[PDB]
Paper text:
One of the most prominent GDHs capable of DET is the bacteria-derived FADGDH complex, with the first reported example derived from Burkholderia cepacia (BcGDH). Bacteria-derived FADGDH complexes are composed of three distinct subunits: a catalytic subunit harboring an FAD cofactor in its catalytic center with an iron sulfur cluster (Fe-S; 3Fe-4S) as the primary electron acceptor of FAD, a small subunit which is a hitch-hiker protein necessary for the bacterial TAT secretion system, and an electron transfer subunit harboring three heme c units. This enzyme can transfer electrons liberated from glucose oxidation directly to the electrode without any redox mediator as a consequence of the architecture of the electron transfer subunit. The electron transfer subunit is required for DET, and followingly, the dissociation of the electron transfer subunit eliminates BcGDH’s DET ability.
The proposed structure is modeled based on X-ray diffraction data analyses of the BcGDH complex crystal grown using the crystallization facility of JAXA on board the Japanese Experiment Module Kibo on the ISS. Through electron density analysis, a partial structure of the electron transfer subunit from βLeu314 to the C-terminal end colored in pink was determined, containing the third heme c. The overall structure revealed the third heme c region of the electron transfer subunit interacts with both catalytic and small subunits. The thioether end of the third heme c is oriented to the Fe-S cluster, and the region from βCys334 to βThr358, colored with magenta including the heme binding motif, interacts with the small subunit colored with cyan. This region is close to the intrinsic disulfide bond formed between αC213 and γC152. The catalytic subunit colored with green mainly interacts with the region between helix1 and helix2 and includes the colored-region in magenta (βIle384 to βAsn394), where the sixth ligand (βM386) of the third heme is located. The edge-to-edge distance between the third heme c and the 3Fe-4S in the catalytic subunit is 7~8 Å. Because of this short distance, it is expected electrons are directly transferred between the 3Fe-4S of the catalytic subunit to the third heme c in the electron transfer subunit. Based on the structural model, 14 candidate amino acid residues were selected to form disulfide bond pairs between the small and electron transfer subunits (5 pairs), as well as the catalytic and electron transfer subunits (9 pairs).
Author numbering:
A (entry chain A): 10 to 539
B (entry chain C): 52 to 168
C (entry chain B): 305 to 425
The structure:
């Protein structure tokens, strides 16, 4: 009845829903199923625990980005190299995510119709609010009470309350808040258990969010892949989809995949859900091209792969005047949602700045030793606690406008092991973001002076935040879009896209929650038709 | 008197810690050297220079390595030890270590109890 | 029981390809809670399972029973719970872990659990 490609949070949910509805489902998974226990030990064994893709081996048949060292699986060109990362394995990229469950603020859903830049959504916030909550109820998300205004109107409160903040995050929260209320530093909404929830456990400050929770305390796509199989959904691990086949009713009738060997297989279904990631979903589309649709299925708009977006990050690291001991609790619980909105957003982009609660005794110890000067164990320890306690780091999400010149196309030369053309991404960062980062740097310098910073280091290199969006743009008409407001494709009735690719604007936050909601949206949609 | 007792008591001298696991100390030992003894020796010769007057330049480089081996837990870019890594237990009172839960949920609310102060 | 050290020499060594390696089963499935050595965190919470009752009984049916499902102590408007391992572990994976646990923590003599796992499901 329903054939879901990709077992990432997106597809996982869809499978589960229709699986519950008593519908026969097939979940197609490119990579293999890696169990919790195995992943952790790989990490615990890795020399660099700042490489969050390391403990996830890129299976030759289903390869993915790896920068330790560079496996160059991505062909990058343009002004800025789109060095993002995803995880091809049963459970999706939510295996290594930070579990930061943020809502898009109303104005995000009407950028051009308000600031006159980018593009509007075919839907408005109030349309996704009821689903937003259902997404917070399925994932299990803790978040502040009314007292803290997240500027996303809530019909109902969070299903869980947030555990106390880390001494580090509570100190810097108060320090800045009392300085300027405009910074508006608040408790971050996240999919972390503040109490035994969904049959899972509660956070115990493993401080390992990225690259992985060894308990399940926080949400991992796998949770629904499980619930999915238990509903009756037939999951096929190591089924890398490469082509989609159509019928005269410009409808999709089957999808073909290669197993570990490279042996092509065919899967026939009634409805199709393209639940691959931001780079992989457009690759399959720009790969299933036939005489019926020369420009590639659901690509009559020629917008498939285009309008690719991801928050160009910018951080700052310094040594505070006071001890903070980053590492006691989750990696991130604080977020400076001050410049998420405002008029200027018609000139430079709005950014969400987040304080780093990651252990730095790993890094700081190394930094001392790199000096290469011998010291007695009293002076050594002295510097270890002095450095690792006073270390603070601020990273932020910048918003880049959806641009058609930024695209993901299957390279017409390079190819993967099983011989599938590998993603060739052409990305560049407009001045719209450059100006925003400029003022974003003035906030960093101030945050320093407030927290009595020393050895203040500025990271002015736009870092990838791994939020691939806009590949299969959403719109009103099919001449400048790919899917409608129902996440359905204009070209193919029974083809649905459940990925950040459908998101017109990237906004100022992490998109996963937005994705999970849109997923549940379709679930009710597909559930009425079939 | 095996090339291991020398190392252990040479390590306690540099690390300034007592009760180091000889199980780890041997692994560090193996990795510090090759399949060789050239490293297993000169240890006694070092212990004398250290626990006395001035140290010869390249006699320092040897110490510095033994330190890193114990604290960082990685030698030649290979993880020999992570939990027992000495850098993680110098502010303890309750060991942190990334990938392991110290105490319980709310543990990170109140101010950490700085050690040797 | 007594502190393990079982993983003391298991760090840096690549993971095994096929076959139940009980030693690593505890490391990846547990440790992060009961800690590598099985000592359990200072402020009690998740207890040390080398001086526990269940860990070393005589007939460990009540032991594996926990590994399968977990615990749900809801008392004190601040409830606890050791999570589930019914869907993330096999009857053989569990039984082999149980034998390791008991043997290197409890009184291994009566430590059986030879595919009694399945019957407990
Ligand atoms: C890397 C990363 C990402 C991340 C993050 C931190 C890191 C280090 N922190 C986040 C955060 O704090 N908040 C947030 O909202 N997002 C955060 N992210 C990003 C997040 O992980 C992803 O945006 C999200 O998980 C995307 O989910 P989705 O379901 O859309 O897709 P996926 O998770 O990437 O899973 C894709 C699945 O599809 C399969 N696949 C891919 N290609 C194929 C083909 N050709 N055939 C078959 N299957 C395919 C993959 O195997 C996978 O199962
Ligand atoms: C993993 C393999 C694993 C095992 C095995 C295990 C065993 C275990 C036992 C035997 C007990 C005693 C409870 C009883 O009376 O039978 C016990 C208790 C707790 N556990 Fe546990 N446990 C394993 C894994 C985990 C994990 C991953 C956590 C938490 C993340 C966890 C926690 C707990 C807690 C808490 C208890 C007791 C609750 C309390 O003392 O407050 N366990 N476990
Ligand atoms: S990995 Fe685990 S329990 Fe807390 S901070 Fe990160 S979630």
């Amino acid at each position: 009845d329903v054939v879901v490609v990709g077992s990432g949070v997106a597809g996982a949910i869809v499978a589960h829903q229709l699986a519950m509805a008593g519908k026969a489902v097939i979940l197609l998974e490119a990579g293999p199923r890696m169990p919790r226990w195995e992943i952790v030990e790989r990490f615990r064994n890795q020399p660099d625990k700042m490489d969050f893709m390391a403990p996830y081996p890129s299976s030759p048949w289903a390869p993915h980005p790896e920068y330790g060292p560079p496996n160059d699986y991505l062909i990058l060109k343009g002004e800025h190299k789109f060095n993002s990362q995803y995880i091809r394995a049963v459970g999706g990229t939510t295996w290594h995510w930070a579990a930061s469950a943020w809502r898009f603020i109303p104005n995000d859903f009407k950028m051009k119709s308000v600031y006159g830049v980018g593009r509007d959504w075919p839907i408005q916030y109030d349309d996704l609010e009821p689903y937003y909550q259902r997404a917070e109820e399925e994932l299990g998300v803790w978040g502040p009470g009314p007292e803290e205004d997240l500027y996303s109107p809530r019909k109902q409160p969070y299903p869980m309350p947030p555990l106390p903040l880390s001494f580090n995050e509570q100190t810097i929260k108060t320090a800045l808040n009392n300085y300027d209320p405009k910074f508006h530093v608040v408790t971050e909404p996240v999919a972390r258990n503040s109490r035994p929830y969904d049959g899972r456990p509660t956070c115990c400050g493993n401080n390992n969010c990225m690259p992985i929770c060894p308990i399940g305390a926080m949400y991992n796509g796998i949770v629904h892949v499980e619930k999915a199989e238990r509903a009756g959904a037939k999951l096929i691990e190591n089924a890398v989809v490469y082509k989609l086949e159509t019928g005269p009713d410009k409808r999709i009738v089957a999808a073909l995949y290669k197993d570990k060997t490279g042996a092509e297989h065919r899967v026939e279904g009634k409805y199709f859900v393209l639940a691959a990631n931001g780079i992989e979903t457009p690759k399959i589309l720009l790969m299933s091209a036939n005489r019926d649709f020369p420009n590639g299925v659901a690509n009559s708009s020629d917008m498939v792969g285009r309008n690719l977006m991801d928050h160009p990050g910018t951080g700052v690291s310094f040594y505070a005047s006071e001890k903070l001991w980053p590492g006691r609790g989750p990696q991130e619980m604080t977020s400076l949602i001050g410049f998420r909105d405002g008029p200027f957003r018609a000139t430079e982009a709005a950014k969400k700045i987040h304080l780093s609660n990651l252990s730095r005794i790993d890094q700081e110890t190394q930094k001392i030793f790199k000096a290469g000067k011998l010291m007695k164990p009293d002076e050594l320890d002295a510097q270890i606690r002095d450095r690792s306690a006073r270390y603070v780091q601020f990273d932020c999400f910048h918003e880049i406008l959806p641009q058609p010149e930024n695209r993901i196309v299957p390279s017409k030369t390079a190819t993967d092991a099983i011989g599938i053309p590998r993603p060739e991404i052409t990305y560049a960062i407009d001045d719209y973001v450059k100006r925003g980062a400029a003022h974003t740097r003035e906030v960093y310098a101030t945050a320093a002076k407030v927290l009595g910073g020393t050895d203040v280091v500025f990271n002015d290199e736009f870092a990838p935040n791994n939020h691939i969006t806009g590949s299969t743009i959403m719109g009103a008409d099919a001449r400048d879009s790919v899917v409608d407001k129902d996440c359905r494709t204009f070209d193919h009735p029974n083809l649905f896209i459940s990925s950040s690719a459908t998101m017109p604007t990237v906004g100022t936050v992490n998109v996963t929650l937005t994705i999970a909601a849109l997923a549940l949206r379709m679930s009710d949609t597909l559930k009425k038709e079939v | 008197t095996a090339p291991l007792d020398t190392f252990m008591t040479l390590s306690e001298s540099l690390t300034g810690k007592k009760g180091l696991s000889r199980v780890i100390g041997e692994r560090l030992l193996q990795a510090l050297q090759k399949g060789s003894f050239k490293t297993a020796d000169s240890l006694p010769q070092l212990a004398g220079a250290l626990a006395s007057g001035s140290l010869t330049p390249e006699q320092e480089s040897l110490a510095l390595t033994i330190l890193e081996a114990w604290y960082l837990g990685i030698v030649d870019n290979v993880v020999i030890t992570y939990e027992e890594a000495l850098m993680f237990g110098v502010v303890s009172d309750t060991l942190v270590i990334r990938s392991y839960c110290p105490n319980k949920p709310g543990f990170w609310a109140d101010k950490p109890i700085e050690r040797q102060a | 029981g007594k502190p393990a050290e079982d993983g003391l020499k298991l760090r840096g060594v690549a993971l095994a390809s096929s076959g139940i390696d009980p030693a690593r089963l505890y490391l990846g499935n547990c440790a992060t809670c009961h800690q590598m050595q099985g000592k359990g965190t200072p402020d009690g919470y998740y207890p040390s399972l080398f001086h526990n009752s269940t860990v070393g009984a005589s007939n460990p049916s009540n032991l594996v029973q926990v590994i399968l499902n977990g615990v749900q102590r809801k008392i004190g408007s601040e409830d606890i719970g050791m999570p589930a391992f019914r869907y993330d572990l096999n009857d053989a994976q569990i039984a082999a872990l149980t034998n390791y646990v008991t043997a290197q923590f409890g009184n291994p003599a009566a430590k059986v659990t030879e595919q009694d796992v399945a019957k407990l499901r």
